[PDB]
Amino acid sequence: GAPGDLYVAGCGVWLPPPVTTEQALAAGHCDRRLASSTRMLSVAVADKETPAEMAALAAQTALDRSGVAPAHVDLVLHASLYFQGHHLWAPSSYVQRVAVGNRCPAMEVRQVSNGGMAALELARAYLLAAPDRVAALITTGDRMHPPGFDRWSSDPGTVYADGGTALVLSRQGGFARLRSLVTVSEPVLEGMHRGGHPFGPPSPEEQRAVDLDAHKRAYVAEAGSSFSVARVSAGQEEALTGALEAAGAGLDDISRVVLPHMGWRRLSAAYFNKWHIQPERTTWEFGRRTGHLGGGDPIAGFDHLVGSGRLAPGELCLLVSVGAGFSWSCAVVELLERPSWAAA
Amino acid sequence: GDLYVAGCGVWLPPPVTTEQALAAGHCDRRLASSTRMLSVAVADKETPAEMAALAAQTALDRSGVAPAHVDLVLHASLYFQGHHLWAPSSYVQRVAVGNRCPAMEVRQVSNGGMAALELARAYLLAAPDRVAALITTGDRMHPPGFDRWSSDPGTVYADGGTALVLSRQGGFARLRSLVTVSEPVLEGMHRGGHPFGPPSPEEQRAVDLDAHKRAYVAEAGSSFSVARVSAGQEEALTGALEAAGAGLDDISRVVLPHMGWRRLSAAYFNKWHIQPERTTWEFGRRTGHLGGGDPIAGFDHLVGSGRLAPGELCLLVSVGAGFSWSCAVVELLERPSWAAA
């Protein structure tokens, strides 16, 4: 391809064993109404593995598949939205030690549920900023366990997964081409996911049981429901239309849509009933068995589409990601060839 | 073409003296004597993003850069930001910038500010029409999760925010070099679990870095650890100086991490043979370790107090657990208008 062309050279996940909704119901973690509203079938849940461990595991898979040498990994970025396990410790340096074994800069990037795409933006910029740079590694990892987090009710309508994802970005080549990547920011909405006055300073710290539902009602009270809904809608539309236009495509040109692993009710309101697309055109069935992987959903979703053979050479894929803040990223990815690790 | 520093700022809450810390039993006489800390900025109710936002307002106002020309917002920190599943960079963007460019967090422990500086540099250089980027740091190191005097004995941690405005267009200073070095073999020094195995299960208990360091040295060896730490530092220093076409003798001022006297003497004064008077020692010892914002606070101090003169080079020195090191050589082009004589 052209110069300035960026490629996906490898990707991978490490997902711990699934806990089914049935197991969750029987264990009092989930009530049947939330089971019915989200239509979740299972969620990946870790036993002992920590976030950086899962991220490093995913990275080893992504790197091997990529065939890219450690000496050509010029940047390591690790994204997450929850506690990485040890304070004043560098999880990106763990990832680098274990999965890459080189000496390039290794750091964390965070943008809540949009962290993976956020890291993708900075990785793209890093590779393009100097002519001699080759590849970048992006990972995500999160472990959403008690007592700090309740994966079913800390944020009702989305069920959170433990796990790690990874993607290798390259200026040199790969099996897919990054046709566009667009990020949109609407910071006016930041107060929706915190205590304190939505337009004043944040309340004192709250390590405790995360409880989004209560802060969101306080935000709407102040800002207005109409304003809140409209602004979320607009940001999503700007990212979608921005990514499609940058790629020379329309929604009809897109074969598969990678959506966030949220519950059915949320996906319908945001995507199925808005964009008038069918679930079978999306990663819905994969997501509903996996759960929300922190900021790593689009990497997991893309990896699944490619590994399963659902995406064919020449076809375009749309990555859709959103995070509190709010931030939205969309990307159009064109599959150039079926990688050797995929099934047909 | 080289980038510019267009503005910078800090927001530091009121000092708590070593005398008061002694009297409250937070600090003993050996620790006061070894660190030689005079005071540390301690926040009352201010949260990290809040302090970061205040420092950013100051830095942006000084820069004169319009919000439309701020193409990226990066917020760095090393400790809990106060609310899970919430976007502190978005708070900072809302409060201090009012614009719609991407806002995100970058972390690298105590090297976070310089790490954000690396990514912001790349971002500005990655497209021909980009102009400025905002980098902020903000942390609040309160009990019972953290003990500012004894979680990492030898360094005393401050609450505060810092901010720098980086531009391709112009500014009062030129970023002449910026170089980052990474030694991930040392990552295990700051966590539980086997230094060369997976991390131990999630902590809880207040930060106890000394327990992890002893466990690391006991496994990897003291000789190995000291030499590798020393080599990383040497690589960053030399890398930055060479990239600027300079030597340590050409540097007028050195911005050092705000560690205690004993650590600074071992790492820098008795290693490089530079005089403490040529550094931000006196500013740091009254301020404390500002998470990853020290080199921003220190450079801001040097400039605003008129200690740096047009034509003179300043060396920023930063290090964080990981380990990661960054050094940068900044040339002062003109004394800005907020700067005393």
Query: Which residue matches tokens 């040199």?
Result: A172
Q: Is the peptide bond before B323 cis (omega within 30 degrees of 0)?
A: yes
Q: Chain A residue with minimal CA distance to B183?
A: A103
Which residues have a Cβ under 8 Å from the Cβ of A202 and sit 6 or more positions away? Answer: A191, A194, A195, A196, B47, B49, B50, B82, B83, B86, B91
For residues A11 and A306, is the Cβ–Cβ distance under 8 A?
yes
Dmax over CA atoms of chain A, in Å, equals 57
* Phi, psi (deg, nearest 5) at residue B98: 70, 15
Q: CB–CB of B103 and A111 under 8 A?
A: yes
For residues A288 and A40, is the Cβ–Cβ distance under 8 A?
yes
Nearest Cα of chain A lies from the Cα of B37 at a distance, in angstroms, of 21
Amino acid at residue number A4: G
For residues B241 and B248, is the Cβ–Cβ distance under 8 A?
yes
DSSP secondary structure of A57-115: HHHHHHHHHHT--GGGEEEEEEE-SS--SSTT--HHHHHIIIII---S-EEEEEBTBTH
Which residues have a Cβ under 8 Å from the Cβ of B233 and sit 6 or more positions away? Answer: B267, B319, B325
Q: How many CB atoms lie within 10 A of CB A312?
A: 12
The candidate with the shortest Cα–Cα distance to A168, out of A64, A76, A62, A91, is A62
The candidate with the shortest Cα–Cα distance to B123, out of A97, A77, A179, A322, is A77
Q: CB–CB of B109 and A129 under 8 A?
A: no
Q: Chain A residue with minimal CA distance to B292?
A: A88
Q: Is the peptide bond before A272 cis (omega within 30 degrees of 0)?
A: no
The candidate with the shortest Cα–Cα distance to B40, out of B153, B150, B148, B161, is B148
SS3 category, B105: strand
Which residues have a Cβ under 8 Å from the Cβ of A2 and sit 6 or more positions away? Answer: none
For residues B319 and B73, is the Cβ–Cβ distance under 8 A?
no
For residues A80 and A140, is the Cβ–Cβ distance under 8 A?
yes
For residues B275 and B254, is the Cβ–Cβ distance under 8 A?
no
Count the residues in chain B: 341
Q: Which helix (H) or strand (E) holds B220?
A: helix B209-220
Q: How many CB atoms lie within 10 A of CB A125?
A: 22
- Structure tokens given for A82: 């929850």
Sign for the CA dihedral angle at B227, B231, B237, B241 comes to positive
Strands A18-20 and A42-44: antiparallel
Structure-determination technique: X-ray
- Taken in order of first residue, the domains within chain B and their CATH numbers are 1-172 (3.40.47.10), 173-332 (3.40.47.10)
A–B: how many Cβ contacts below 8 A?
240
Q: Which helix (H) or strand (E) holds B177?
A: strand B173-182
Rounded CA separation A232/B173 (Å): 40
Helix residue spans in chain A (DSSP H): 21-26, 32-38, 51-66, 91-95, 115-128, 212-223, 225-247, 264-267, 273-275, 284-290, 297-308
Burial of B97 (0-12, 13-18, 19+ CB in 10 A): buried
Which residues have a Cβ under 8 Å from the Cβ of B64 and sit 6 or more positions away? Answer: B6, B7
SS3 category, B2: coil
Q: Which of A206, A212, A325 sits opposite B103 (nearest CB)?
A: A325
* Resolution as reported, in Å: 2.2
Dmax over CA atoms of chain B, in Å, equals 57
DSSP secondary structure of B12-64: -PPEEEHHHHHHTTSS-HHHHHHH---EEE--SS--HHHHHHHHHHHHHHHHT
Judging contacts by C-beta atoms under 8 Å, the chain A residues touching residue B45 are 204
Rounded CA separation B169/B10 (Å): 23
Count of CA atoms in the C-beta half-sphere (13 A) of B229: 22
Rounded CA separation A94/A76 (Å): 11
Nearest Cα of chain A lies from the Cα of B298 at a distance, in angstroms, of 21
The candidate with the shortest Cα–Cα distance to B167, out of B144, B135, B143, is B135
Nearest Cα of chain B lies from the Cα of A235 at a distance, in angstroms, of 10
- Structure tokens given for A279: 């679930």
Which residues have a Cβ under 8 Å from the Cβ of A67 and sit 6 or more positions away? Answer: A9, A10
Nearest Cα of chain B lies from the Cα of A228 at a distance, in angstroms, of 15
Residues A18-21: contacts with CB within 8 Å, 24+ apart?
Answer: A18/A42, A18/A43, A18/A44, A18/A45, A18/A289, A18/A290, A19/A43, A19/A44, A19/A45
Judging contacts by C-beta atoms under 8 Å, the chain A residues touching residue B103 are 111, 185, 187, 325, 327
